[PDB]
Amino acid sequence: VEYDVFLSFRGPDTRKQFTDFLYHFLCYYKIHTFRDDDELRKGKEIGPNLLRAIDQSKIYVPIISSGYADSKWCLMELAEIVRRQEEDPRRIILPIFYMVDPSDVRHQTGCYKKAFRKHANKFDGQTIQNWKDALKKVGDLKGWHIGKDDEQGAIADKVSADIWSHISKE
Amino acid sequence: VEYDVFLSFRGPDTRKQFTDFLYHFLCYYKIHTFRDDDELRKGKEIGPNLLRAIDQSKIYVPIISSGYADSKWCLMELAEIVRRQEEDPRRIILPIFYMVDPSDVRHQTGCYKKAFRKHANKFDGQTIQNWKDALKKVGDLKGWHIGKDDEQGAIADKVSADIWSHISKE
Amino acid sequence: VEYDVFLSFRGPDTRKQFTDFLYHFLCYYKIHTFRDDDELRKGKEIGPNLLRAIDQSKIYVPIISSGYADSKWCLMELAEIVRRQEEDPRRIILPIFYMVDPSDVRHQTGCYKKAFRKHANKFDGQTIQNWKDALKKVGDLKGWHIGKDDEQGAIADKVSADIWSHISKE
Amino acid sequence: VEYDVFLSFRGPDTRKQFTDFLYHFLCYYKIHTFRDDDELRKGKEIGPNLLRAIDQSKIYVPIISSGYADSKWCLMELAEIVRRQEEDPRRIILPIFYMVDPSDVRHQTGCYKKAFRKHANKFDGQTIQNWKDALKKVGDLKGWHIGKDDEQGAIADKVSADIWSHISKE
């Protein structure tokens, strides 16, 4: 009746490209999945929607993309995932890199440089250091890299069971 | 008194650069680690050495490199790792890609094509299909990708504790 | 609460290749280590950063590399290490040669010739003689040479305890 | 009245070139030094000569050369130095490499392969492994490398005081 898996991704990039199939494939294993498309903006952080499901989730599974560092709504939300995780280690994180190196995520260089080249003219000089401290630790856990040739279909089946193995056996 | 971790790597590539620290840093967490450098060749597969420790190990942790597909001994040995794993799933595998894409490992193309271009003129036409079937499934589990810029030191500490977390808590 | 060990190295050469693991292996012996990556350039010599920790350090441990004689910041900074050491001999220096002969360091010939020739068209004709006088005396103390085959891992454990032996026994 | 420093070297190589000065320069600092030239051979290991002074010495200071791995007496004698040192760590070892890399000493390869290619046809299959285990650990401590250009004179003065500093201050 509650949520056992909570996703997070980019807007226009992978909302129909691949994450959509995983939502439809996952529902075939009899588990309730949460994905959201509402652009929020109704304020700066909504409570009864995101904040509710965050504490209700069980396996936070982000999906870092190529342009995941531009939306001013994703990063600060990810800062709430990995922060809540460090307080109670009962839950886990299974990131999935996508079309990007597992090196442009630990130092925000490469395809993120100019993203933080303009993000530094608006916000505080400490809030940005809060993101780069949280975004870094995500790029150290285990994760299926998806190269240019790997099957966008076989990976889904392999990763889904790893989410279903931690539920049946508990 | 027995082995709880068994490694596997390339000869001249990463024997003295990155994998050597893994043996010296890991021994500081009070766990017995096995690494071997003897070129074997005394026959075709030694028993009391490799075959003994294989069944004695607890967490098989390979380290796929860039030229891991040339040494005849390594591949056919890896075919014995992932095969023994599929019979008893009590143990696990935590591969670590290295200076290579997580896409040139599922289809043996790219930097491996030259390798299997000459390996097909010696052995059977079925033994090769046995390797490509085993080498593929390794490139689907979780794994820390190490890009050109990631710190060769911080990764070690992060990956070591993940091997030490599955021992203390059991 | 203060620093007991202060490092110094080249930028792009050994910042992730080997010096990185030492910072992670050393922290496992419960001692606070200082390493810095900020390119400075904010002026010509920063005070509250480098100058503070220099006097706060206890065992200055440089790591001379192959291209350690090109960066305009490193040499003139090393001239401040060995100079402060000669006034109070309570502290020590444990250099570690790297991929270079212990002969190309006492006379600046070999792989340092062209770089020194270029540096002579900008600065004073006495400041350069100040470096060559300081860089020479460093290449006379004790030091673990690391050849092409020595294990990059076993050396770390051997050298770390020699830094930890001078702390526990005092 | 007893010996505070005990040397060890090759026969024809460095008996009259560099080590001879060390005996004459060192005696100018008012310390009693022991060097021996008798070829022994009167049996297999003499007692009242070598075995007496070994336990009487205070700072064992070998001088590894280029052909230090051929004489059947030197190695097995060095196996008695580093072995007695490991029981009481009150004393120390200050090796001095010479015209050789600090890499051909940790793995007995390069200029020593010919040496142990013929030494394995006479003695036991375990006594040889005893030497390679002792000769290795010597090549990990601190040591002044002497390259092709370093002054054979300035090094002596620098190394002598380091032996005299551990005597006056105690």
Side-chain angles (χ1 to χ4, degrees), chain A residues 19-76:
Chain A
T19 309
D20 207 282
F21 297 88
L22 202 270
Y23 184 80
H24 288 89
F25 199 98
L26 196 58
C27 209
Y28 276 52
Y29 276 173
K30 320 193 85 74
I31 65 185
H32 205 256
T33 322
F34 181 21
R35 78 163 167 202
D36 215 58
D37 198 283
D38 272 355
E39 334 293 331
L40 213 194
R41 303 153 163 260
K42 296 159 285 181
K44 302 276 210 153
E45 176 65 22
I46 190 75
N49 301 339
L50 267 44
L51 283 216
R52 166 208 34 164
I54 279 313
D55 296 3
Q56 295 288 332
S57 32
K58 181 176 291 273
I59 306 87
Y60 316 73
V61 186
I63 294 181
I64 275 189
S65 164
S66 330
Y68 187 63
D70 297 11
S71 121
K72 66 172 182 183
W73 306 100
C74 308
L75 277 311
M76 84 162 182

Side-chain angles (χ1 to χ4, degrees), chain C residues 52-72:
Chain C
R52 166 208 34 164
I54 279 313
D55 296 2
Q56 295 288 332
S57 32
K58 181 176 291 273
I59 306 87
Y60 316 73
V61 186
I63 293 181
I64 275 189
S65 164
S66 330
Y68 187 63
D70 297 11
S71 121
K72 31 189 171 178

Side-chain angles (χ1 to χ4, degrees), chain B residues 21 24 28 37 60-61 64 66 70 73-74 81-82 95 101 110 116 129-130 144 148 153 162 166:
Chain B
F21 288 95
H24 288 269
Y28 277 52
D37 198 283
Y60 316 73
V61 186
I64 275 189
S66 331
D70 297 11
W73 308 116
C74 308
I81 323 187
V82 91
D101 312 314
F116 283 31
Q129 186 64 22
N130 195 358
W144 299 260
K148 301 231 67 61
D162 276 70
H166 301 158

Side-chain angles (χ1 to χ4, degrees), chain C residues 94 97 101-104 106-107 109 137 139-151 154-155 158 162 166, chain D residues 94 97 101-104 106-107 109 137 139-151 154-155 158 162 166:
Chain C
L94 288 319
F97 308 151
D101 312 314
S103 102
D104 262 30
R106 289 82 143 147
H107 324 283
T109 162
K137 198 191 72 62
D140 281 14
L141 323 176
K142 325 186 179 182
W144 300 260
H145 180 302
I146 290 195
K148 301 231 67 60
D149 296 359
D150 277 41
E151 303 150 320
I155 297 301
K158 179 58 212 173
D162 276 70
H166 301 158
Chain D
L94 288 319
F97 308 151
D101 313 314
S103 102
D104 262 30
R106 289 82 143 147
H107 324 283
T109 162
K137 198 191 72 62
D140 280 14
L141 323 176
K142 325 186 179 182
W144 300 260
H145 180 302
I146 290 195
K148 301 231 67 60
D149 296 359
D150 277 41
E151 303 150 320
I155 297 301
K158 179 58 212 173
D162 276 70
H166 301 158

Side-chain angles (χ1 to χ4, degrees), chain C residues 14-151:
Chain C
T14 106
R15 177 46 183 117
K16 37 76 95 299
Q17 215 68 225
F18 160 78
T19 313
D20 206 282
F21 304 78
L22 204 270
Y23 185 80
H24 288 89
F25 199 98
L26 196 58
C27 209
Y28 277 52
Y29 276 173
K30 320 193 85 74
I31 65 185
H32 205 256
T33 322
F34 181 21
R35 78 163 167 202
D36 215 58
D37 198 283
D38 272 356
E39 334 293 331
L40 213 194
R41 303 153 163 260
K42 296 159 285 181
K44 302 276 210 153
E45 176 65 22
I46 190 75
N49 301 339
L50 267 44
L51 283 216
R52 166 208 34 164
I54 279 313
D55 296 2
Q56 295 288 332
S57 32
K58 181 176 291 273
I59 306 87
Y60 316 73
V61 186
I63 293 181
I64 275 189
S65 164
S66 330
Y68 187 63
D70 297 11
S71 121
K72 31 189 171 178
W73 308 116
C74 308
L75 277 311
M76 84 162 182
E77 182 267 2
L78 184 129
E80 201 72 18
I81 323 187
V82 91
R83 204 264 311 167
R84 176 74 25 172
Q85 142 73 13
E86 281 194 320
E87 164 272 357
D88 189 343
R90 190 176 79 108
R91 296 158 287 202
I92 47 197
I93 289 195
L94 288 319
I96 284 169
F97 308 151
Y98 193 114
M99 285 301 105
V100 91
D101 312 314
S103 102
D104 262 30
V105 88
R106 289 82 143 147
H107 324 283
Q108 313 97 15
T109 162
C111 317
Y112 290 12
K113 264 295 163 286
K114 262 64 179 302
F116 266 96
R117 172 206 282 188
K118 100 82 42 81
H119 299 328
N121 302 345
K122 284 68 209 155
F123 292 71
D124 183 300
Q126 194 269 7
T127 323
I128 289 187
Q129 186 64 22
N130 195 357
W131 290 347
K132 276 185 268 156
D133 199 327
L135 186 59
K136 185 173 65 53
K137 198 191 72 62
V138 149
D140 281 14
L141 323 176
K142 325 186 179 182
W144 300 260
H145 180 302
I146 290 195
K148 301 231 67 60
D149 296 359
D150 277 41
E151 303 150 320

Side-chain angles (χ1 to χ4, degrees), chain A residues 94 97 102-104 106-107 109 139-151 154-155 158 162 166, chain B residues 94 97 101-104 106-107 109 139-151 154-155 158 162 166:
Chain A
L94 288 319
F97 308 151
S103 101
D104 262 30
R106 289 82 143 147
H107 324 283
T109 162
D140 281 13
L141 323 176
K142 325 186 179 182
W144 300 260
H145 180 302
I146 290 195
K148 301 231 67 60
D149 296 359
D150 276 41
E151 303 150 320
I155 297 300
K158 179 58 212 173
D162 276 70
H166 301 158
Chain B
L94 288 319
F97 308 151
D101 312 314
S103 102
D104 262 30
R106 289 82 143 147
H107 324 283
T109 162
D140 281 14
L141 323 176
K142 325 186 179 182
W144 299 260
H145 180 302
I146 290 195
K148 301 231 67 61
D149 296 359
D150 277 41
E151 303 150 320
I155 297 301
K158 179 58 212 173
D162 276 70
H166 301 158

